[PDB]
Paper text:
Staphylococcus epidermidis expresses glycerol phosphate wall teichoic acid (WTA), but some health care–associated methicillin-resistant S. epidermidis (HA-MRSE) clones produce a second, ribitol phosphate (RboP) WTA, resembling that of the aggressive pathogen Staphylococcus aureus. We report here that the TarM enzyme of HA-MRSE [TarM(Se)] glycosylates RboP-WTA with glucose, instead of N-acetylglucosamine (GlcNAc) by TarM(Sa) in S. aureus. Each blade of the homotrimer contains a catalytic domain with a canonical GT-B fold, consisting of an N-terminal acceptor substrate-binding domain (ABD; residues 1 to 68 and 202 to 302) and a C-terminal nucleotide-binding domain (residues 303 to 492). TarM(Se) is a retaining WTA glycosyltransferase; therefore, the relative positions of donor and acceptor substrates in TarM(Se) and TarP are different.
The backbone amide and carbonyl groups of Thr383 form two hydrogen bonds with the O2 and N3 atoms of the base, providing specificity for uridine, and the aromatic ring system of the base is stacked against the Tyr382 side chain. The tandem backbone amide groups of Leu407 and Ser408 contact the α-phosphate of UDP-glucose and another main-chain amide group from Gly17 interacts with β-phosphate. In addition, the side chains of Arg326 and Lys331, each form two salt bridges with the β-phosphate. The side chain of Gln330 is hydrogen-bonded to the C2 hydroxyl. The related enzyme TarM(Sa), which accepts UDP-GlcNAc as donor substrate, has a threonine at this position. The binding site for UDP-glucose in TarM(Se) is composed of eight amino acids, seven of which are identical to that for UDP-GlcNAc in TarM(Sa). The only difference is Gln330 in TarM(Se) and Thr330 in TarM(Sa), which clearly suggests a key role for this residue in allowing TarM(Se) to discriminate against the use of UDP-GlcNAc as a donor substrate.
Numbering used by the authors: 1 to 492
């Protein structure tokens, strides 16, 4: 009878620990007769394809539904008409009627009005989608998106080519939602729902109204806010009976800031703890630090659910050091390159395999090239198949400067790999047993990390022994039954 709604701004196929944690939690809840649905707030025309890939890749349970305002309001708008209305496409065809089409590239064409002596449009055509950029006085004023043969969205641009408005279209070709965009700030302003003839001040109010419509106001319905950016949307609903929880997935302290300052999003959640049923943390240490500053009484520790990988045959014969993460400053990748430089100096056979995507790619590439590590350190992009890549790693490392819990470290340990990790707040000190399943290193100590990496690369038997203890440690600490009991207590 308990229904859960796990809230994050968006879902995609190239995401990190938070999305993994949520999808795993949904699967375990569903095995315990508790519905675990995801709610997102962003527009993706291809959301069907993302969800299919997440299910077929075994990341997402087939029973885990995703609710989303664009999907919900489109399905309602679709009921209002029987036949497709071609007014928009006719308006475009009429605009370009006089215009001659000239191919610029393989996919790009331009429309020139011979009469007016002016270029009115650019068109880019792909397999599934066609984009039109419309121009007046050599300035773009609108973009039209065709997907699967129909207009799904239009965008309006000012004279600075900044987005000032977005319009969304139903499966019958009708406008059902439009919003103003602040051109410089790129923030969402007034939002208009065409069906209800209803106006909202901003995206928070619109998304809070969506939650009011989607979730019945009963105590057997639970909102779990995972995305810290989404917390204002769950706080500002008119629900009086629904249970509301916030999960803190990461160190709340300002990144690379020793002042004791706390991040704005996490500070907002923690200051408003009294307005919700509970704040869930992943470690006792994080709960302790939060209780000290915020004097919260509804704080709870529940570890992330973990997917126990199946025991496998280790065909290990390669000295590869593995690292799988979002390429973000949090992960201390410059410290990793420093460790790699020392390890490569004493063993040229050592490869460092870095899997993931992010802003830091160009910086790390420069560091690899600068230290002549192009042979030894390789950025291999995002993998939907992390398990297979880990199986061929000798050891996995973390240079991370902060965590909520090391899910990539846990994943490696479950696949019987030894781990070497900087001892950072709300991170690996819970599950890394220094000398038994891997090594806990003083933060930013390059030499100590490098030495233990070399010790493991030079001693396969020790590596295998530490690895088996790691798998056993994770199975013992993060038994799904214990976590299910903790969640069920919160729900009652
Ligand atoms: O190419 C890649 C790169 C990453 N991942 C996955 O991304 C996740 C990484 O999670 P984690 O190591 O925990 O890092 P974050 O993405 O930073 O996770 C955040 O959210 C998690 C959920 O609570 C917390 O455990 C972390 O501490 C917190 O930083 C893992 O499941 C990886 O398998 C891939 O699948 N492929
Ligand atoms: Cl094509
Ligand atoms: Cl203007
Ligand atoms: Cl602005």
């Amino acid at each position: 009878m308990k229904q859960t709604y796990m809230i994050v701004n968006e879902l995609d196929v190239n995401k990190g620990g938070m999305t993994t944690a949520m999808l795993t939690r949904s699967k375990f809840f569903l095995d315990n007769e508790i519905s675990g649905d995801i709610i997102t707030f962003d527009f993706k025309a291809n959301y069907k394809d993302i969800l299919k890939e997440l299910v077929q890749s075994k990341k997402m349970d087939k029973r885990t539904q995703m609710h989303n305002p664009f999907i919900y309001f489109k399905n309602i708008s679709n009921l209002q008409h029987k036949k497709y209305n071609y007014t928009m496409t006719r308006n475009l065809s009429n605009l370009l009627k006089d215009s001659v089409e000239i191919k610029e590239n393989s996919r790009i064409s331009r429309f020139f009005n011979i009469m007016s002596r002016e270029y009115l449009a650019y068109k880019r055509e792909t397999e599934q989608e066609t984009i039109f950029d419309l121009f007046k006085n050599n300035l773009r004023y609108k973009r039209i998106y065709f997907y699967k043969g129909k207009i799904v969205k239009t965008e309006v641009f000012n004279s600075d080519n900044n987005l000032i408005a977005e319009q969304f279209y139903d499966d019958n070709g009708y406008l059902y939602l439009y919003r103003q965009i602040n051109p410089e700030k790129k923030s969402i302003g007034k939002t208009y729902l065409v069906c209800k003839e209803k106006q909202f001040k901003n995206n928070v109010e619109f998304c809070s109204y969506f939650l009011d419509k989607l979730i019945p106001d009963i105590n057997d319905n639970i909102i779990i806010c995972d995305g810290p950016g989404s917390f204002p949307k769950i706080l500002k609903t008119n629900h009086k009976n629904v249970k509301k929880f916030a999960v803190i997935h990461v160190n709340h302290y300002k990144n690379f800031d020793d002042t004791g300052a706390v991040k704005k999003q996490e500070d907002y959640i923690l200051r408003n703890a009294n307005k919700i049923n509970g704040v869930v943390m992943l470690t006792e240490a994080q709960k302790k630090d939060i209780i000290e500053k915020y004097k919260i009484t509804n704080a709870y520790v529940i570890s992330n659910f973990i997917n126990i990988t199946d025991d496998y045959r280790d065909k290990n014969d390669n000295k590869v050091v593995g690292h799988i993460s979002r390429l973000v400053p949090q992960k201390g990748l410059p410290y990793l390159i420093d460790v790699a430089k020392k390890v490569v100096e004493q063993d040229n056979s050592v490869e460092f395999h870095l899997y993931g995507t992010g802003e830091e790619k160009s910086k790390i590439e420069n560091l690899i090239q600068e230290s002549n590590l192009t042979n030894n350190v390789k950025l291999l992009g995002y993998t939907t198949n992390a398990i297979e890549k880990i199986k061929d790693f000798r050891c996995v490392i973390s240079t991370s400067q902060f965590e909520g819990q090391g899910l990539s470290l846990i994943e490696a340990m479950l696949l019987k790999k030894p781990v070497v990790a900087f001892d950072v707040k709300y991170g690996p000190s819970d599950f890394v047993k220094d000398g038994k399943n891997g090594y806990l290193i003083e933060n930013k100590d390059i030499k100590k990390m490098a030495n233990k990496i070399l010790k493991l690369l030079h001693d396969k038997e020790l590596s295998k022994s530490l690895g088996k203890h790691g798998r056993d440690t994770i199975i013992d600490m993060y038994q799904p039954e214990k976590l299910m009991v903790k969640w069920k207590q919160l729900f009652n």
